[PDB]
Write a protein that binds this ligand. Structure first.
Ligand code: IJR
Length: 129
């Protein structure tokens, strides 16, 4: 919990209206479940600890951080109003990785594997019931 890392994204706020939808249930039970247990998930399971990794420029570059630990908390503590908000958090996580890291890099190949699974699952996101 270094003072040099920012506070994580919000996962609890009583002022924000919340709703359970069948699409948000799918995102937790199918999408997050699938990606969390992937061999390459672990770099994405918590906020980037730029101190531990000796990357002092990370939060100079990435101004909208997101990770699957935060998404999991948001889904489990239903923070979201709709599926689009959660889909945007996944998209942000992937795009941050591709912006910060070189296209060669192991971390980018890991994110691409997770994004390929993600796209397959989101194409099947159920009709809002
Ligand atoms: C989620 C994410 O982008 N993590 C990054 C910061 C990471 O682990 N870097 C790989 C390298 C070397 Br320089």
């Amino acid at each position: 919990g270094s003072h040099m890392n920012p506070p994580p994204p919000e996962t609890s706020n009583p002022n924000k209206p919340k709703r359970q939808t069948n699409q948000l249930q799918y995102l937790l039970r199918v999408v997050l479940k699938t990606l969390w247990k992937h061999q390459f998930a672990w770099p994405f399971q918590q906020p980037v600890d730029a101190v531990k990794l000796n990357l002092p420029d990370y939060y100079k570059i990435i101004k909208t951080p997101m990770d699957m630990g935060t998404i999991k908390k948001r889904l489990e503590n239903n923070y979201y109003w709709n599926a689009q908000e959660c889909i945007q958090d996944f998209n942000t996580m992937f795009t941050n990785c591709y912006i910060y890291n070189k296209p060669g890099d192991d971390i980018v190949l890991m994110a691409e594997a997770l994004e390929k699974l993600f796209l397959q699952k989101i194409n099947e996101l159920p009709t809002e019931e």
